[PDB]
Amino acid sequence: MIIPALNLIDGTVVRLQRDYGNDPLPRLQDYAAQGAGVLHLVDLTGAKDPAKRQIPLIKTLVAGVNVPVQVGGGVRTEEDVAALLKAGVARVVIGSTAVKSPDVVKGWFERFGAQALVLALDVRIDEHGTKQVAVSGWQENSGVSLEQLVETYLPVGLKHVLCTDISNVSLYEEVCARYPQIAFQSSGGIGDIDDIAALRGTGVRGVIVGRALLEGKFTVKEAIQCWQN
Numbered sequence: 001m002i003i004p005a006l007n008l009i010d011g012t013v014v015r016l017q018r019d020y021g022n023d024p025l026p027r028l029q030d031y032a033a034q035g036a037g038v039l040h041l042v043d044l045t046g047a048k049d050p051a052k053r054q055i056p057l058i059k060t061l062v063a064g065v066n067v068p069v070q071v072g073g074g075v076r077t078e079e080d081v082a083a084l085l086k087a088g089v090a091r092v093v094i095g096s097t098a099v100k101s102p103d104v105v106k107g108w109f110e111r112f113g114a115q116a117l118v119l120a121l122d123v124r125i126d127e128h129g130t131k132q133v134a135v136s137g138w139q140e141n142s143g144v145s146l147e148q149l150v151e152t153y154l155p156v157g158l159k160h161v162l163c164t165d166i167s168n169v170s171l172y173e174e175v176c177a178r179y180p181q182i183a184f185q186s187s188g189g190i191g192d193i194d195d196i197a198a199l200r201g202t203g204v205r206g207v208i209v210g211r212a213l214l215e216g217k218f219t220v221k222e223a224i225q226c227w228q229n
């Protein structure tokens, strides 16, 4: 599947900061109209300040489309997860907290179930060739590999992993083969339609596409047609 994505700040569509308007819902609806089966939202406001998580906007956006939406952005507590699910999102995306407090997040897998959670890992390949997990592009490696972290969560049913390279096709070929029971999502690196063709057959289950759609390089419809071949 293709997974079209938007980043939101105070109701505004942005790309990291370029502004793309205050009307996210017509965009999402047209992404769905073209055949998308899943949408992806990052709440940058909420990531910066969990008091200001855009629950009301997200409720509206989810109600306005007919496909599952996965939503992340500084999810830190059990309460955050439950509030997003209650507002109707299909899956909550968890990056930083999943690296920081794995035993606590394993509890969340037990409470909400693996179908409701996506583990998001920022990865950079270090000089030693190791796929290191980092909590963001602005901070050093955490001293845990992709493999270690994935294997920490497998005993509680881990199913969905979102993997971004922030240091390439080879990466995804390798991790998808090693964990065939996990559905990996690629994120970043899509500059034109050929980057999508390049991911076909790697074993990646979902391709997240953000900026390229906003900049008009191709449509969701063309991306799906290339993806499905």
Ligand SMILES: NC(=O)c1ncn([C@@H]2O[C@H](COP(=O)(O)O)[C@@H](O)[C@H]2O)c1/N=C/N[C@@H]1O[C@H](COP(=O)(O)O)[C@@H](O)[C@H]1O
Binding pocket: 005, 006, 007, 016, 040, 042, 044, 047, 072, 073, 074, 075, 093, 094, 095, 096, 097, 120, 121, 122, 135, 162, 164, 187, 188, 189, 190, 208, 209, 210, 211, 212
């Ligand atoms: N400041 C940020 O940019 C940021 N902060 C957190 N995230 C993501 O949110 C998720 C949860 O992170 P936490 O806040 O829980 O730590 C993770 O996936 C992070 O990568 C962030 N990601 C933002 N944009 C994403 O980066 C990729 C760019 O794609 P492109 O347009 O096609 O080129 C896509 O996945 C976009 O949705």
